[PDB]
Amino acid sequence: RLKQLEXKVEXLLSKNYHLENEVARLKKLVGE
Amino acid sequence: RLKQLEXKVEXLLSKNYHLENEVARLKKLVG
């Protein structure tokens, strides 16, 4: 169970970083 | 440990939902 939870943290973090990159890219687009 | 990890998963699910909302908002603005 611990390892499954650990894998979920890693997956969510990776997903989070992709969403942060996306947001930063979109902000360059608008000018904010 | 299980409780802290369960708490990190929830904390991260929440940031991701907030980030998905920003992406959607910025896309409306662009557009």
Short mmCIF file of N, CA, C and O in Angstrom, two decimals, unseen atoms left out:
data_model
loop_
_atom_site.label_atom_id
_atom_site.label_comp_id
_atom_site.label_asym_id
_atom_site.label_seq_id
_atom_site.Cartn_x
_atom_site.Cartn_y
_atom_site.Cartn_z
N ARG A 1 0.82 -1.21 0.00
CA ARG A 1 0.00 0.00 0.00
C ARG A 1 0.85 1.26 0.00
O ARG A 1 0.48 2.27 -0.60
N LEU A 2 1.99 1.20 0.68
CA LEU A 2 2.87 2.35 0.80
C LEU A 2 3.46 2.72 -0.56
O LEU A 2 3.60 3.89 -0.91
N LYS A 3 3.80 1.69 -1.33
CA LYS A 3 4.48 1.88 -2.60
C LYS A 3 3.50 2.41 -3.64
O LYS A 3 3.88 3.19 -4.51
N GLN A 4 2.25 1.98 -3.53
CA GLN A 4 1.18 2.43 -4.41
C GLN A 4 0.93 3.91 -4.14
O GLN A 4 0.72 4.69 -5.07
N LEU A 5 0.94 4.29 -2.87
CA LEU A 5 0.74 5.69 -2.49
C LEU A 5 1.92 6.53 -2.95
O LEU A 5 1.75 7.66 -3.40
N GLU A 6 3.11 5.96 -2.83
CA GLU A 6 4.31 6.62 -3.29
C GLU A 6 4.29 6.80 -4.80
O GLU A 6 4.72 7.83 -5.31
N UNK A 7 3.77 5.81 -5.53
CA UNK A 7 3.70 5.94 -7.00
C UNK A 7 2.71 7.04 -7.43
O UNK A 7 2.94 7.72 -8.44
N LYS A 8 1.65 7.20 -6.64
CA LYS A 8 0.61 8.18 -6.90
C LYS A 8 1.12 9.60 -6.66
O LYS A 8 0.79 10.52 -7.41
N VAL A 9 1.94 9.76 -5.63
CA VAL A 9 2.58 11.04 -5.35
C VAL A 9 3.49 11.46 -6.52
O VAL A 9 3.49 12.62 -6.96
N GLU A 10 4.23 10.50 -7.05
CA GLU A 10 5.18 10.73 -8.13
C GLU A 10 4.46 11.12 -9.42
O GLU A 10 4.83 12.07 -10.11
N UNK A 11 3.41 10.36 -9.73
CA UNK A 11 2.54 10.62 -10.88
C UNK A 11 1.87 11.99 -10.75
O UNK A 11 1.89 12.74 -11.74
N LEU A 12 1.29 12.32 -9.60
CA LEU A 12 0.65 13.62 -9.42
C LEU A 12 1.64 14.78 -9.54
O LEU A 12 1.32 15.81 -10.13
N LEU A 13 2.83 14.61 -8.98
CA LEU A 13 3.87 15.63 -9.06
C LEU A 13 4.26 15.89 -10.52
O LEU A 13 4.44 17.04 -10.92
N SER A 14 4.39 14.81 -11.28
CA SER A 14 4.78 14.90 -12.69
C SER A 14 3.70 15.61 -13.47
O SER A 14 3.97 16.46 -14.33
N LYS A 15 2.46 15.25 -13.17
CA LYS A 15 1.30 15.87 -13.76
C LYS A 15 1.28 17.35 -13.38
O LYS A 15 0.98 18.21 -14.20
N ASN A 16 1.62 17.65 -12.12
CA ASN A 16 1.64 19.02 -11.64
C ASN A 16 2.65 19.89 -12.39
O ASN A 16 2.36 21.04 -12.72
N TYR A 17 3.82 19.33 -12.65
CA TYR A 17 4.87 20.06 -13.34
C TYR A 17 4.48 20.36 -14.78
O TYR A 17 4.79 21.43 -15.31
N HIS A 18 3.79 19.42 -15.42
CA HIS A 18 3.30 19.64 -16.78
C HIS A 18 2.23 20.73 -16.83
O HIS A 18 2.18 21.52 -17.77
N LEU A 19 1.38 20.76 -15.80
CA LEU A 19 0.38 21.81 -15.70
C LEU A 19 1.01 23.17 -15.36
O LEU A 19 0.57 24.20 -15.86
N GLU A 20 2.07 23.18 -14.55
CA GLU A 20 2.80 24.44 -14.31
C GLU A 20 3.48 24.98 -15.55
O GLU A 20 3.55 26.19 -15.72
N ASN A 21 4.01 24.09 -16.39
CA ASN A 21 4.67 24.54 -17.61
C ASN A 21 3.65 25.11 -18.57
O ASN A 21 3.89 26.13 -19.22
N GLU A 22 2.51 24.44 -18.66
CA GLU A 22 1.41 24.82 -19.52
C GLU A 22 0.94 26.23 -19.12
O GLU A 22 0.86 27.13 -19.95
N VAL A 23 0.65 26.42 -17.83
CA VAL A 23 0.22 27.72 -17.31
C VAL A 23 1.20 28.85 -17.63
O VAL A 23 0.79 29.94 -18.03
N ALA A 24 2.50 28.59 -17.48
CA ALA A 24 3.55 29.58 -17.73
C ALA A 24 3.64 29.97 -19.19
O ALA A 24 3.96 31.11 -19.53
N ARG A 25 3.38 28.99 -20.05
CA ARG A 25 3.33 29.17 -21.50
C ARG A 25 2.14 30.01 -21.91
O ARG A 25 2.24 30.87 -22.78
N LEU A 26 1.00 29.75 -21.28
CA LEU A 26 -0.23 30.47 -21.61
C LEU A 26 -0.16 31.92 -21.15
O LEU A 26 -0.70 32.81 -21.81
N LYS A 27 0.53 32.17 -20.04
CA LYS A 27 0.71 33.52 -19.53
C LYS A 27 1.57 34.39 -20.44
O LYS A 27 1.36 35.59 -20.56
N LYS A 28 2.57 33.76 -21.09
CA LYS A 28 3.37 34.44 -22.11
C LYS A 28 2.49 34.82 -23.29
O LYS A 28 2.73 35.82 -23.94
N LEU A 29 1.50 33.99 -23.58
CA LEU A 29 0.60 34.21 -24.71
C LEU A 29 -0.28 35.45 -24.52
O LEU A 29 -0.45 36.24 -25.45
N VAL A 30 -0.85 35.58 -23.33
CA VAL A 30 -1.79 36.67 -23.01
C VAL A 30 -1.07 37.98 -22.71
O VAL A 30 -1.51 39.06 -23.13
N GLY A 31 0.04 37.87 -21.99
CA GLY A 31 0.81 39.02 -21.54
C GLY A 31 0.53 39.29 -20.08
O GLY A 31 0.52 40.45 -19.66
N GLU A 32 0.32 38.24 -19.30
CA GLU A 32 0.14 38.38 -17.85
C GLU A 32 1.19 37.61 -17.05
O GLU A 32 2.14 37.07 -17.62
N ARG B 1 3.24 6.79 8.27
CA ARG B 1 3.72 7.12 6.93
C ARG B 1 2.57 7.11 5.94
O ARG B 1 2.50 7.97 5.06
N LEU B 2 1.68 6.14 6.08
CA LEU B 2 0.56 6.00 5.17
C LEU B 2 -0.31 7.24 5.20
O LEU B 2 -0.79 7.70 4.17
N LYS B 3 -0.49 7.81 6.39
CA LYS B 3 -1.32 8.99 6.55
C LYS B 3 -0.70 10.25 5.96
O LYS B 3 -1.42 11.08 5.42
N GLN B 4 0.62 10.38 6.04
CA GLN B 4 1.29 11.53 5.45
C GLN B 4 1.29 11.44 3.93
O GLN B 4 1.12 12.44 3.25
N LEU B 5 1.49 10.23 3.42
CA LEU B 5 1.45 9.99 1.99
C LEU B 5 0.03 10.20 1.45
O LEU B 5 -0.14 10.76 0.38
N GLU B 6 -0.98 9.76 2.21
CA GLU B 6 -2.37 9.95 1.79
C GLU B 6 -2.69 11.43 1.78
O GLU B 6 -3.48 11.89 0.96
N UNK B 7 -2.08 12.15 2.70
CA UNK B 7 -2.25 13.60 2.81
C UNK B 7 -1.54 14.38 1.67
O UNK B 7 -2.11 15.37 1.17
N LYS B 8 -0.36 13.91 1.26
CA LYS B 8 0.34 14.46 0.10
C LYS B 8 -0.41 14.22 -1.21
O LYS B 8 -0.45 15.10 -2.06
N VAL B 9 -0.97 13.03 -1.38
CA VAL B 9 -1.76 12.75 -2.57
C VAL B 9 -2.95 13.72 -2.67
O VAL B 9 -3.22 14.26 -3.73
N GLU B 10 -3.62 13.96 -1.55
CA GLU B 10 -4.78 14.84 -1.58
C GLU B 10 -4.37 16.27 -1.84
O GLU B 10 -5.01 16.98 -2.61
N UNK B 11 -3.29 16.69 -1.17
CA UNK B 11 -2.75 18.05 -1.31
C UNK B 11 -2.43 18.33 -2.82
O UNK B 11 -2.78 19.41 -3.35
N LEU B 12 -1.80 17.34 -3.47
CA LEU B 12 -1.37 17.39 -4.88
C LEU B 12 -2.52 17.31 -5.88
O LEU B 12 -2.49 17.95 -6.93
N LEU B 13 -3.55 16.51 -5.55
CA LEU B 13 -4.76 16.42 -6.36
C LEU B 13 -5.43 17.78 -6.41
O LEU B 13 -5.99 18.18 -7.44
N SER B 14 -5.38 18.48 -5.28
CA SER B 14 -5.97 19.81 -5.15
C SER B 14 -5.22 20.88 -5.94
O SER B 14 -5.85 21.71 -6.60
N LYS B 15 -3.90 20.87 -5.88
CA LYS B 15 -3.10 21.81 -6.68
C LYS B 15 -3.33 21.54 -8.16
O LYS B 15 -3.42 22.47 -8.95
N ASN B 16 -3.41 20.27 -8.53
CA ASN B 16 -3.62 19.92 -9.93
C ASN B 16 -4.99 20.41 -10.43
O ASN B 16 -5.09 20.90 -11.55
N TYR B 17 -6.02 20.30 -9.59
CA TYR B 17 -7.35 20.78 -9.96
C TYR B 17 -7.34 22.30 -10.08
O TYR B 17 -7.98 22.86 -10.97
N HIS B 18 -6.60 22.96 -9.18
CA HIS B 18 -6.44 24.40 -9.30
C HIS B 18 -5.68 24.77 -10.58
O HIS B 18 -6.02 25.75 -11.24
N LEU B 19 -4.68 23.98 -10.94
CA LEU B 19 -3.89 24.27 -12.14
C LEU B 19 -4.65 24.02 -13.43
O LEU B 19 -4.44 24.70 -14.44
N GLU B 20 -5.52 23.01 -13.40
CA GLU B 20 -6.38 22.72 -14.53
C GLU B 20 -7.37 23.85 -14.75
O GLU B 20 -7.72 24.17 -15.89
N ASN B 21 -7.81 24.48 -13.66
CA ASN B 21 -8.69 25.65 -13.74
C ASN B 21 -7.99 26.88 -14.32
O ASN B 21 -8.59 27.63 -15.08
N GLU B 22 -6.72 27.09 -13.96
CA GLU B 22 -5.93 28.19 -14.51
C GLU B 22 -5.71 28.02 -16.01
O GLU B 22 -5.87 28.97 -16.77
N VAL B 23 -5.33 26.82 -16.40
CA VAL B 23 -5.13 26.49 -17.81
C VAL B 23 -6.42 26.81 -18.58
O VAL B 23 -6.38 27.47 -19.62
N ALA B 24 -7.56 26.37 -18.06
CA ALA B 24 -8.84 26.59 -18.72
C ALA B 24 -9.19 28.08 -18.79
O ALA B 24 -9.71 28.55 -19.81
N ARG B 25 -8.90 28.81 -17.73
CA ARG B 25 -9.13 30.25 -17.69
C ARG B 25 -8.26 31.01 -18.68
O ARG B 25 -8.72 31.91 -19.39
N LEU B 26 -6.97 30.66 -18.71
CA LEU B 26 -6.02 31.35 -19.57
C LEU B 26 -6.33 31.07 -21.04
O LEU B 26 -6.11 31.91 -21.90
N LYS B 27 -6.87 29.88 -21.31
CA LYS B 27 -7.28 29.51 -22.66
C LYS B 27 -8.52 30.28 -23.13
O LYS B 27 -8.65 30.56 -24.33
N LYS B 28 -9.40 30.62 -22.20
CA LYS B 28 -10.57 31.45 -22.50
C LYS B 28 -10.14 32.86 -22.85
O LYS B 28 -10.69 33.50 -23.75
N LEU B 29 -9.13 33.33 -22.12
CA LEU B 29 -8.56 34.66 -22.25
C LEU B 29 -7.81 34.84 -23.55
O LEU B 29 -7.83 35.91 -24.16
N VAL B 30 -7.11 33.79 -23.94
CA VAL B 30 -6.28 33.79 -25.14
C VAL B 30 -7.20 33.86 -26.35
O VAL B 30 -6.87 34.50 -27.35
N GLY B 31 -8.36 33.23 -26.24
CA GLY B 31 -9.35 33.25 -27.31
#
